[PDB]
Design a protein around this ligand. Structure first.
Ligand SMILES: Nc1ncnc2[nH]cnc12
Ligand SMILES: Nc1ncnc2[nH]cnc12
Lengths: 348, 348
């Protein structure tokens, strides 16, 4: 059951963190000189699934794929089938996330949570329906549906942990996905749609107006309650969004770190944190998405990404690209020499 | 001779770049979706030493070590000997740059251009003198000295290329080094010293005032000519700074890319670009240094770093940390599938 899951998310280990901090301070460098790498190391040491130290075992990127009924509103220029095509490509290792994950030594897990096509061999089957409801005229799905998918994904996630995975990355694939993402951000942050609606996958500037209108409509019609993340996800989200949120809850329950991706991922994170604030300490930002509503979303999460690449591909590509940074914090922690051993003495 | 060297720096290959751009546009993703990774790939393809394509062979980080007479002005809290100690540690693989380079699969080259100590076995000997002159009361060195070191380092650099190195990173090690760095930045950018003088290696806030004064003094006394980078380096720079500039000139002559590090490196880059504007296209920013004058320096170089880590260690640690990003752009270019092969058609 979900209340359980949520109840059992562990708090960070302050004891391990204090020990890490001390250790870091004693390394062969001026104190605090490695800035964010230091902070990251300490954050990791506090994660219970990591065994009191910054460490990275196996790495996995979970890609949540699904179609959206809102596509029918003219909010996306990519043909609908691209979701299904790209999902298959994920199985062949030719996509952007695939290439970047291989470079990071991570394995990619492609999960179908609701593609509007026949099942794709090689893809993890967790399909809710053939694409979610069109949010412009009603809810994306039922609360039950959302809750069940949350449970299902969270479990799959924590189970990988059982197989040696210590670091997750989350991603999505779904045509028209920046629409539900903007709606969610608008609702959670109380920003006006104009402020958070972007061009997604090369939407022409002309067509923007309509996208903003669709977003407002979705919100007005559904009346999602901002204090209820599940309410929001079910009404104006999508299966893919629900799935990403589920990865987050799962990794937190498991006491392990999750690397966010871009805009879509920020939307899901907002939901996750609303649902369970205890999730927060397990999230690690990757890059700063080029999507318009990115700054607002990040501000609400109080997150400052490490990478500024103007990326807007999705798929979990940003997450993969940041994995080496996480590994660097561990390397720093473990392999650097100590000041004391050099007889070096530097003022705090 | 230097005029030669400078004269022979190759322009970027526009033909290769056009071909790269086209190729990138045809990959399995919405056009321009990979943002800066795309731009980086194109930049690399234009570098003659790379053989018309984004590629990365062997990687090296060159660490320039030297002492500064200005240390006697009370501008640095690290004891002087730390330079010599850390330089030796570089030979043992225990320093920050060492750990990060190993993580990136790069080799570290420690070069002594003027440490105020006995020679360190294992360190490349290119020592000019036992520490440079105190810039607060006169020049750091003679023009001749600077010119010769420029030549010497540039040659060493291009020679590594001959051994399979395709990507360099530059770094420095030297107590009190942020002082000459600030002076240089002030002179090249025409900013007031207060604006560019930082805390370096944990300088106490109280002591700042004196550092600003030392910088102004150096400038007033020496009257370095901003339109003459060699003039500037020789007067208010240091051996380490000269060395970094030399790496830059060398890699450019060789038609290969160089990853900058932090503040010190930006100072050297400003000099290099002043000396030879043709160097510019070969430079790649890594991170955004936490040193105060960082923003000003970057603005003058028109560079936007990829990494925001609040780092201020030096040694070339930021350069190392960015190597995987460069490799990612190559992986993207080479391993991704093509839209056409999927029968996918997306609007530009
Ligand atoms: N002041 C310093 N102390 C120790 N290691 C360093 N590496 C770079 N600067 C340093
Ligand atoms: N619209 C899109 N087209 C192709 N690949 C994609 N990966 C993520 N979004 C995509």
């Amino acid at each position: 059951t979900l209340h359980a899951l949520l109840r059992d998310i562990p708090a960070p280990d302050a004891e391990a963190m204090a020990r890490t901090q001390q250790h870091i301070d004693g390394l062969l460098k001026p104190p605090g000189s490695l800035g964010r790498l230091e902070t990251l190391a300490v954050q990791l040491a506090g994660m219970p699934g990591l065994n009191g130290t910054p460490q990275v075992g196996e790495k996995a990127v979970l890609v949540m794929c699904a179609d959206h009924g809102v596509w029918d509103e003219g909010v996306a220029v990519s043909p609908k089938i691209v979701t299904a095509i790209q999902a298959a490509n994920m199985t062949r290792g030719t996509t952007g996330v695939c290439v970047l994950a291989a470079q990071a030594g991570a394995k990619v897990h492609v999960i179908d949570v609701g593609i509007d096509a026949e099942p794709i061999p090689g893809v993890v089957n967790m399909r809710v329906a053939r694409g979610c409801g069109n949010i412009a005229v009603g809810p994306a799905m039922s609360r039950l549906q959302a809750e069940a998918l949350l449970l299902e994904v969270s479990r799959y996630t924590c189970d990988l942990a059982q197989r040696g995975v210590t670091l997750f990355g989350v991603g999505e694939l779904g045509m028209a996905n920046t629409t539900p993402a903007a709606a969610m951000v608008s609702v959670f942050t109380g920003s006006d749609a104009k402020e958070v609606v972007g061009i997604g996958a090369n939407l022409p500037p002309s067509r923007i107006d309509n996208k903003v209108d669709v977003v407002r409509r979705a919100i007005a019609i559904n009346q999602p309650n901002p204090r209820d993340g599940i309410d929001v996800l079910s009404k104006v989200g999508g299966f893919d969004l629900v799935g990403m949120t589920g990865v987050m809850l799962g990794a937190a329950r498991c006491g392990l770190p999750v690397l966010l991706d871009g805009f879509l991922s920020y939307s899901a994170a907002l939901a996750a944190c609303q649902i369970a604030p205890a999730v927060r300490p397990y999230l690690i930002p990757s890059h700063f998405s080029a999507e318009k509503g990115a700054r607002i979303a990040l501000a609400h999460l109080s997150m400052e990404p490490y990478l500024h690449m103007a990326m807007r591909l999705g798929e979990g590509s940003g997450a993969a690209l940041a994995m080496p940074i996480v590994e660097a914090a561990c390397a720093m922690f473990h392999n650097m020499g100590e000041l004391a051993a050099s007889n070096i003495v530097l003022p705090e």
